[PDB]
Amino acid sequence: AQMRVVAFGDQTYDCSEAVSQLLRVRDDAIVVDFLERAPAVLKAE
Amino acid sequence: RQHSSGQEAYPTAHDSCITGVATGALTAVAVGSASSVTALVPLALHTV
Amino acid sequence: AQMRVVAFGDQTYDCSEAVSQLLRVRDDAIVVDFLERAPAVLKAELARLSSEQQEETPRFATLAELVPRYRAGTLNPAVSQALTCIAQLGLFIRQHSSGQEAYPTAHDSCITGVATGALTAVAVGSASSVTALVPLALHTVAVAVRLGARAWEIGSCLADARRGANGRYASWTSAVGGISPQDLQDRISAYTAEQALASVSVPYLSAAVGPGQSSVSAAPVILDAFLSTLLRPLTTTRLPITAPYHAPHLFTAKDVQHVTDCLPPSEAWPTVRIPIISFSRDEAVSRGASFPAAMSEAVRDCLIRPIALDRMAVSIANHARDLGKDSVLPSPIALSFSDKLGPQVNSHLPTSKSIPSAIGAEQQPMAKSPIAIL
Amino acid sequence: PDAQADKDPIQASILGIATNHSAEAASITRPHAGAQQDLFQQVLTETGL
Amino acid sequence: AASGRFPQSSSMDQFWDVLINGVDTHELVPPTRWNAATHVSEDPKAKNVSGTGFGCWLHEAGEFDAAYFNMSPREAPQVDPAQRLALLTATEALEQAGVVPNRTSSTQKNRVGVWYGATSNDWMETNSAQNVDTYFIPGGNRAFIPGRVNYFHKFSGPSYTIDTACSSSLAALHMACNALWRGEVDTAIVGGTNVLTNPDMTAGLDAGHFLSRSGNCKTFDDEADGYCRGEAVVTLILKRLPDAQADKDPIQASILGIATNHSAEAASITRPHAGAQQDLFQQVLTETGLTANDISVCEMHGTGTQAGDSGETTSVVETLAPLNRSGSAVRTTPLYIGAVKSNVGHAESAAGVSSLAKILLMLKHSKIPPHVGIKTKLNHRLPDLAARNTHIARSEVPWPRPKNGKRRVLLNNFSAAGGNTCLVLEDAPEPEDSQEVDPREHHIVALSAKTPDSMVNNLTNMITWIDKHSGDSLATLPQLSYTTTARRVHHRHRAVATGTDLLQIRSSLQEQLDRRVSGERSIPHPPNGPSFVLAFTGQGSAFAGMGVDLYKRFASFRSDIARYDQICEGMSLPSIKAMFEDEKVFSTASPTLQQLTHVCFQMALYRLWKSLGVQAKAVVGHALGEYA
Amino acid sequence: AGVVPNRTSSTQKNRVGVWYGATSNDWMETNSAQNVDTYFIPGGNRAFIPGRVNYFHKFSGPSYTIDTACSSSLAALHMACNALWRGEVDTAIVGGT
Amino acid sequence: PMAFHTGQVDPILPELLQVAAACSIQDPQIPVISPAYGKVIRSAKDFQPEYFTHHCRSSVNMVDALQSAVEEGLLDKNVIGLEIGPGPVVTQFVKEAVGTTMQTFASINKDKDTWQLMTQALAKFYLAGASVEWSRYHEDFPGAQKVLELPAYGWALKNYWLQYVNDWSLRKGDPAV
Amino acid sequence: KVLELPAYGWALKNYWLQYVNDWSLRKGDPAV
Amino acid sequence: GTVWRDALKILSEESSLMSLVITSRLRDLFEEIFDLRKRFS
């Protein structure tokens, strides 16, 4: 009866490599869709 | 990506919990408020 | 304590308006990504075929140029089959991403389908998300075209194209009314005995609809000859089924195996988590089967077993009772005469608003959208 | 989305558009009606009406 | 596949010869285009006179087969060489690639789109303009460059011409990738043309200080005064990888991503600057998902300009060869940078595809050719390439492919119209398992033409070619067999030869050639759609193992036989499939089995010949043969 | 259209494209051809039709000229619509000359 | 073993008539030279069930059918014959009917190979001008169909050119002087 | 809201290179 | 027979654009050689 905990970090973790790897996602369209709307709504705000 | 391309099952209150520090808190709210990746995405953009 | 049923249709439903209103979809990226993608897995399995399919293969630039040749009847069973399947998946993928509608789960919902819908049904039952449905859904596109393609192989073999066709493809199926399926079966047997016809060329009862309704399939020359013997008060109406289906004498297990050869072997195939109501069998409910096995079984429903649409309603209701649900929502997708389904299922048994979102979110995304001229 | 977001004027909206080529023509000079009709229904599908 | 015509090159292979031998093809304008004595002056003073005459010229650009593309001798001249050559190269590429009309589903009518870049229509300005006639706009307008390719081959898909000036063809490649990723098309035909007959193009370029009055493009040379004229025509065949692997088509390489921006921040309308270029390079790296180390070679848009070369080089090294803050190279492997323009000149519209073509041969032969653009000394504006492990190969360097790995390349094609476009390329997928010999022992070679003279020519050329390649490999005859038969667009008059090996093919073609040379007049044998009557025999002459080769080799035939067998078994008839699989059964086999085997054999055989488009004027059959 | 570059997200300079159809440049064939000079080629090639627009307003997005002959402009419109459809540009400038 | 087209096949004709009666008959798309009737049939009226019993029992009249064909102009020396079947038995009869110079060959025979007869035949056939889709004939071997690169096809080219002459470009804008 | 207002008032001048002496009819001919 | 002789040359120089040109030159075939020659009489 193991329980998984989903833990997110703060600014201290370097997300440059992360996002660099997320712009590589192609297999599933929701990731490129999310990364498409995110900067647009971002700059809109 | 982990829960759609990675085909990892979505967290459930029974078998799992969420946590976050600073930014992670906001994102944690978003994952804690959906049943599915599809239902997570709008709350995801709200969180952005 | 309500249970929604997702019911898919067959070739009879005209998907021209369906496909039309699908490429209108600008409200989600996975719809246009999937719909645009469909030709890719499709064409990846369009090339392994016989020569005659390469003869009369129509041109289609996208999923759009098939529509006029569909209405005109000049579209083959392989592509028209794949087109109906694409339309069904597109409407679903729409409704559950564009439409902000939650994905089916085993607790509150079941799936059902008729012929093409059975293939569609396997795909929806096997995924945990729309995004996870996308690849399986394409694998199903390839299965659909190979299904219609093999049906056209054997059907072309039985009878070739007529001289007065002018590119229009004749319907192998017709709907009969005013007689019980058993009584009509007796009339078929009698016609068989009295007329000289082969064992493969015989007419057969393709579907059982209702107490006085059913559907019979034979050759346009043969079917015409048989239907000419049925006189009023009985009714006869045409349907767009352009290849022989549901014929255990024409097809065997090897044909099913072959249609599904486009699915590579692997151990990671997801199983069917949502129960699918397969009403045309001994086992009314099937869950947990692997996606390839489920697909081959659905292909067998299409090719081998007859449709028993008189058993569909009660089949849904039985499962609704099994989970202790008072009533059902119908959620039909491209289903002929869908409006009357809901009452029929609820007869065996004893409210919506849009969700607003962020400013600019409730509308369509910023990827695809009906471009405004400023 | 961007148009309405920026409160831009909108005189109309393009649903869709499509292109094919008249390959079945007799001559290089005259486009023929078969391809054109298939293209009209092509945009009526892509647009959805 | 890719086919093209470049300076001193009638094929991709002779362009490899240009590159690997360090050939420099620039020369004074030949008299066929325009007279240098009157049009060129050391110091131009008179109007429409230029300071340079030099270019790299396709001396065979006028050569065209009017009978192959359905053209009359009066119409063919008035067609631009860009149109004619585009038709030739596009055809050849279809023969080298996986596309034939009515073959697989990737070859259908509208699923095949065409895009071509073109920056100059001089033919209509200069040559056909002396006497205008009906086929002036039919032969001069650029839209017909892709158009004619759609009409002849009956490709109904989209048709476009792109003009971004010197970036045009790579821009058209961008459009093509966007359509292949929209679903509009799957087969895509991409090319570019730049054949020029006007001296004004030259004089205007020189007036703008674009062209170099010394020589060719000198990329990276300390004294670099401009680019130089160059001429090329290319067509390629492109497909999404899933469909390409579905058909087992040949794949020379795979394009991962391509992007386009514009240099808006420029202080002028002429020179593209470095900021936009770098932002583009990193954009494509992030998009395609690769680090600097993954790219080992970069084909630059080198125009042999001090400003252009230094600017672009800085953008390339700062992307692909960054330097540590301490001053050590971030690169673990070497970068080799080059420019094709130093050899075959600046093809302008066709420059992009020319560069890509260079890569396809570099990939094939596993070598990096020498860089001849440096005449005297390296440019002093360039950053220190050696500290960053960037290199300009002066002589050829081994370029082997890592085991279970793919090297990837960055290509650049930019324009004085300031658009900037580049792609990331990758080696083709490894085979499924390994090589295998064709189990077919005997092969068939098909030759065609629309004229007897052309026929004689094709026969002779084929014989000489066989004499050249006769002993290289055993796989030459199976490849050329399946290729000549399927991959070709044949016409009425047509010749055939068979054999186990290339020698028998030669002996056959030589025999037919002798019949053509001696005892054959100049008129053709009847071109009526040469009436066939098909004769079907009775079961008398049937024998054991009859048509086993047809049953083992031909799939359509196997489909028909297997189908007929199941049709028989469902009707309470004996199984005929065994007669073709095993021969021994013929001894004890019953009359019904013999008879059904014969008639199935004839129906299948008839369908086979009909699959070859044999139009039967009538049929006759003798006893049992009539049933077929 | 009230477009001010870099005012909003959709009007940012790098999200703006240009596409124009053109059947021929008769200017450099006939008019400037009588006397060729330095601005002959800048003034005559079709690619500068969209280019010049990008340079003046400092739009760093794509620049293209399309020639399908008498369908050129709608072909350019099609490419532009595709760019907005795939997210390549926020705003598209479409025209014909 | 038996003797066809003789009195031997008399008892099978009634049942054979019923076999023919269960069929579906259409007008021929191309003419049928019928040895049963020694005549050229263009209509479905002649293919009725009686045809197949008549055929089985009646003699095979090649000479009357062929001679009937040539008199109509359907056959002549320019026409191509093609043997679909084992051995060239029937082509020799057509050849003897129309003329000695008609090109007629076969493909599958026990003496020569398939490919030998095929090149001698297919050469002359396609030399006469026929059309093909070679794809349908070779689109085969789902695993052995590997395609590699080869040079281009041999071209028979002629120079089509309009020579720029008189250097008129330098005189642009000037009058005739 | 965006009102439709007059376009920018342009300071316009005619910039033109006259085609003269009908030299296009004599293409291919010598000077004479 | 004179016009039979001339018409063949009018064909050889051209051979639906071309067809309309051929018949226009007759006065001054894609839809409507022996069919032509007999269509004269």
Q: What is the DSSP string of E502-530?
A: HHHHHHHHHHHHHHHHSS--SSPSP-SS-
Nearest to C131 among A28, A36, A37 (CB): A28
| Angle between the N-to-C axes of helices C291-303 and C116-126, in degrees from 0 to 180, rounded to the nearest 10 | 170
> E strand or H helix at E248, and its extent?
none
Long-range contacts of C68-73 (CB under 8 A, 24+ apart): C68/D37, C68/D38, C68/D41, C69/D38, C70/C14, C70/C15, C70/C16, C71/C14, C71/C16, C72/C167, C72/C168, C73/C168, C73/C169, C73/C240, C73/C242
A7 three-state secondary structure: strand
Could you give the CA distance from residue G13 to residue G58 in angstroms, rounded to a whole number? 11
Q: Is the dihedral of CA C298, C301, C303, C309 positive or negative?
A: negative
What resolution in angstroms does the PDB record give? 7.1
Whole-number Å distance between alpha carbons of E625 and E536? 4
Token pair recorded at residue C287: 């869950």
Total CB pairs under 8 A between chain F and H:
13
| Nearest in space to E209 (alpha carbons), one of E224, E231, E230 | E224
Place of tokens 């789109």: E113
Which residues pair with residue E28 across a beta bridge? E54
d(CA C16, CA C24): 12
Question: Which tokens belong to G126?
Answer: 């396609």
Cis peptide leading into residue C211 (ω within 30°): no
Tell me, yes or no, if C372 comes closer than 8 A to chain G by beta carbon: no
Tokens at C279, concatenated: 């009403």
Per-residue tokens: E281: 């390079």
Assigned token pair, C291: 């996606």
Residue F44 and residue C237: Cα distance in Å, rounded?
Answer: 66
CA proximity to C222, closest of C128, C159, C293: C159
> CA-to-CA distance for C173 and C189, rounded, in angstroms?
17
The tokens for G128 are 């006469």
**Which ranges in chain G belong to alpha helices (H)?**
13-21, 49-57, 62-71, 90-98, 114-127, 134-138
Cα torsion for E77, E79, E81, E87, to the nearest 10°?
A: -120
Instruction: Name C267's Cβ contacts closer than 8 Å, sequence gap at least 6.
Output: none
Tell me the β-bridge partners of A6.
Answer: B18
> At residue F31, what are phi and psi to the nearest 5 degrees?
-75, -60
Is beta strand E54-56 parallel, antiparallel or unpaired with respect to E229-230?
Answer: parallel
Question: What's the gap between Cα E468 and its chain centre?
Answer: 22
Taking CB atoms and an 8 Å limit, are C61 and D14 in contact across chains? no
SS3 category, E278: helix
| Rounded Cα–Cα distance for residues C175 and C214 (Å) | 6
Torsion of Cα atoms, C224 then C226 then C228 then C232, to 10°: -130
Chains E and I touch (3+ CB pairs under 8 A): yes
Q: Residue E462 corresponds to which tokens in the numbers above?
A: 């084929």
**Which residues have C-beta within 8 Å of that of residue C228, sequence separation ≥ 6?**
none
DSSP-based helix, strand, coil % in chain F, nearest 5: 45, 15, 40
- Give Cα separations from E295 to A16, E317, F33 (angstroms): 20, 12, 45
Subunits with 3+ Cβ pairs within 8 Å of I are D, E
Q: Which two tokens stand for residue E467?
A: 């004499």
| Interface residue ranges in chain D relative to chain E, Cβ cutoff 8 Å | 19-25, 28-29, 35
Sign of the dihedral through C-alpha E323, E325, E326, E332: negative
CA distance E244 to C33: 20
Per-residue b or e along G102-125, where b marks 16 or more CB atoms closer than 10 Å to that residue's CB: bbbbbbbbeeeebbbbbbbbbbbb
C9 is written with which tokens? Answer: 């249709």
Q: How many helices (H) and strands (E) does chain E have?
A: 20, 21
User: Residue C206 and residue C189: Cα distance in Å, rounded?
Assistant: 14
Task: Give the burial class of E48: count Cβ atoms within 10 A of its Cβ; 0-12 exposed, 13-18 middle, 19 or more buried.
Answer: buried
Q: Which amino acid is at G147?
A: V
Q: How big is chain I, counted in residues?
A: 41
Q: Residue holding tokens 């679909």? A: G84
E346 included as an active-site residue: yes
What is the C-alpha separation between E592 and E568, in angstroms, rounded? 11
Taking the C-alpha atoms of residue F56 and residue F74, their distance in angstroms, rounded to an integer, is 24
> What single string gives the DSSP state of each residue in I25-39?
HHH------HHHHHH
Nearest residue in G to H28, CA atom:
G165
Nearest to E160 by CA among E148, E171, E146: E146
User: Are the beta carbons of E246 and C200 separated by less than 8 Å?
Assistant: no
DSSP characters over D1-49: -HHHHTT---SEE----------S-SSSS---HHHHHHHHHHHHHHHT-
Q: Residue E243 and residue C44: Cβ atoms within 8 Å?
A: yes
Q: DSSP for E564-585?
A: HHHHHHHTT----HHHHH-SGG
CA dihedral (F12, F14, F17, F18) positive or negative = positive
Tokens at E375, concatenated? 């005449």
Q: Are G69 and G38 in contact (CB under 8 A)?
A: no
- CB-based burial of residue E360 (10 Å sphere; 0-12 exposed, 13-18 middle, 19+ buried)? buried
Contact E109, E151 (CB under 8 A): no
- φ/ψ (deg, to 5) at C47: -80, -30
Structure tokens, E558: 């196997």
Start-to-end C-alpha separation, chain E: 42
Tell me the C-alpha distance between G170 and G168, whole Å: 5
Beta sheet of C307-308, edge-to-edge order: C235-238, C173-177, C213-217, C204-208, C307-308
**What ranges make up the beta strands (E) of chain F?**
16-21, 63-66, 91-96
Q: Which residues does E390 contact at the CB level (< 8 Å), separation at least 6?
A: E317, E320, E321, E334, E335, E336, E337
| CA separation, residue B28 to residues A11, B43, E213, E254, F33 (Å) | 15, 11, 67, 40, 69
The span from the CA of I36 to the CA of I22, in Å, is 11
Q: Which residue of F has its CA nearest to G171?
A: F34
Element housing G24 (H / E)? none
Given CB atoms, is C366 within the 8 Å cutoff of chain A?
Answer: yes
Closest CA to E596 of E572, E562, E553, E564: E564
Looking at residue C54, the DSSP 8-state letter turns out to be H
SS (H, E, C) E352-419: HHHHHHHHHHHHHHCEECCCCCCCCCECCCCCCCHHHCEECCCCCEECCCCCCCCCEEEEEEECCCCE
CA E496 to chain CA centroid, nearest Å: 25
F70 CB-contact burial (10 Å; exposed 0-12 / middle 13-18 / buried 19+): exposed
Residue D31 main-chain phi, psi, to 5 deg: -60, 140
Contact C54 E103 (CB under 8 A): yes
CA distances from G5 to E594, E597, E627, G54 (A): 18, 21, 15, 9
Question: CA-based Rg of chain G, rounded to a whole angstrom?
Answer: 28
Query: Do residues E141 and E124 lie in contact, with contact meaning Cβ atoms separated by under 8 Å?
Result: yes
Q: Write down the catalytic residue from E26, E346, E371, E598.
A: E346
Q: Give E277→chain F minimum CA distance, Å.
A: 11
Q: Bridge partners of E4?
A: E234
Q: Within a 10 A sphere around the Cβ of G86, how many other Cβ atoms? A: 24
Q: What are phi and psi of H9, to 5 degrees?
A: -75, 120
Residue linked to tokens 């008539």: G17
Report the alpha-carbon distance of residue E348 to residue E344 in Å, rounded.
Answer: 11
SS3 E44: coil
Q: b vs e for E568-607, b when ≥16 Cβ sit within 10 Å of the residue's Cβ?
A: beeeeebebbbbbeeeebbeebeeebbbbbbbbbbbbbbb
HEC readout, B4-21: CCCCCCCCCCCCEEEEEC
Q: Is C197 on the interface with G (CB under 8 A)?
A: yes
Write out the catalytic residue numbers of F. Answer: 70
Q: Which residues contact C18 (CB under 8 A, 6 or more apart)?
A: C87, C88, C90, C91, C334
**Chain F positions in Cβ-Cβ contact with residue G172 (cut-off 8 Å):** 33-35
* Euclidean distance between CA atoms C300 and G100, whole angstroms: 59
Distance separating alpha carbons of residues C339 and C332, to the nearest angstrom: 8
Q: Which helix (H) or strand (E) holds C136?
A: helix C130-158
To the nearest whole angstrom, how far is the Cα of A20 from the nearest Cα of chain B?
14
Euclidean distance between CA atoms C338 and C318, whole angstroms: 20
Determine contact, residues G122/G132, Cβ cutoff 8 Å.
Answer: no
Q: State the smallest CA–CA distance between residue F37 and chain E in angstroms.
A: 5
- Cα C216 to Cα E166: distance, rounded to the nearest angstrom: 65
- Cross-strand pairs, E56: E230
* Contact call for F and G: 3+ CB–CB distances under 8 Å: yes
CA torsion sign for F60, F65, F66, F72 is positive
Cα–Cα–Cα angle for E443, E446, E448, rounded to 5 degrees: 175
C-alpha–C-alpha distance, residues C286 and C278, integer Å = 7
Residue type, C348: H
Determine which helix (DSSP H) or strand (DSSP E) holds A15, and give its type and residue range.
Answer: none
Quote the CA–CA distance of E375 and F81 in Å, as a whole number: 48
